[PDB]
Amino acid sequence: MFKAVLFDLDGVITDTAEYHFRAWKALAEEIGINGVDRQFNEQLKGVSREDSLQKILDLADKKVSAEEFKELAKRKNDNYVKMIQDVSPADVYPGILQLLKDLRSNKIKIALASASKNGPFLLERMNLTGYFDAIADPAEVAASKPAPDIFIAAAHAVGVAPSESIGLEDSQAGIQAIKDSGALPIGVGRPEDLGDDIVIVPDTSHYTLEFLKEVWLQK
Ligand SMILES: [Mg+2]
């Protein structure tokens, strides 16, 4: 049987995407650039703060100083950090709390493998800290998803090999990272997005200890 479950945060435990979008739209409004809508925002997911700001500046072909660029990026993040002050246990996705309770009682390690620089803060605010045996520090990983580094780090931090672990993710990049770590991915979402070759559930209410055990045995 598997020995650990490696969780991403956004799209698995809770939603951070909505707050990122609001922080970028607020910032875009302040400097008078139109076109930062949820459709545009798809081009911001999975990219660096700097690269996302550059994409928003390209909308208006706006140039800034290196100093102003750094300030705008910082403002966006300060805005983001203010908005996530609202996060509570009410924002934990369906099934996730009960899953973490069952894993813990069954002595299965729990690690976060998130690029969130606020993962620890966000787990405290949702009252989940007590379930996690490790959080992989994204500032200490050389390469982002779809590179496996952060899933490897999360597994090593709880004393297992990725080969002994299940990884939970909703993103193409995330599923590819889990697969290349040697962990077994279980996707949440749509086969059209995440591939036909892995087990996928429509939503997190299906991520149960019993379902995870069935998947591991079946391959
Ligand atoms: Mg995700």
Residue numbers in the entry: 1 to 219
Cite, word for word, the article reporting this structure.
βPGM is a monomeric magnesium-dependent phosphoryl transfer enzyme of the haloacid dehalogenase (HAD) superfamily. The active site is located in the cleft between the α/β core domain (M1–D15, S88–K216) and the α-helical cap domain (T16–V87), with closure of the cleft through domain reorientation occurring during catalysis. Two phosphate group binding sites are present, a proximal site adjacent to the carboxylate nucleophile and the catalytic Mg2+ ion, and a distal site located ~8 Å away in the closed enzyme.
However, minor chemical shift changes in the active site loops and the sharpening of some peaks that were line-broadened under standard conditions indicated that one of the milk components was binding in the vicinity of the active site. The two dominant organic components of the filtered milk were lactose and citrate. Titration of lactose into βPGMWT had no effect on the 1H15N-TROSY spectrum, whereas titration of citrate led to equivalent chemical shift changes and sharpening of line-broadened peaks to those observed in milk. Two chains are present in the crystallographic asymmetric unit, one of which has citrate and acetate bound, whilst the other has tris and acetate bound. Citrate is coordinated in the active site by residues T16, H20, V47–R49 and A115–K117 and mimics substrate binding to some extent. Both monomers share a similar fold and overlay closely with a previously reported substrate-free βPGMWT structure (PDB 2WHE29; non-H atom RMSDs of 0.56 Å and 0.95 Å). Although only one of the two conformers observed in solution is represented in the crystal, the NMR experiments show that both conformer A and conformer B remain well-populated under physiological conditions.
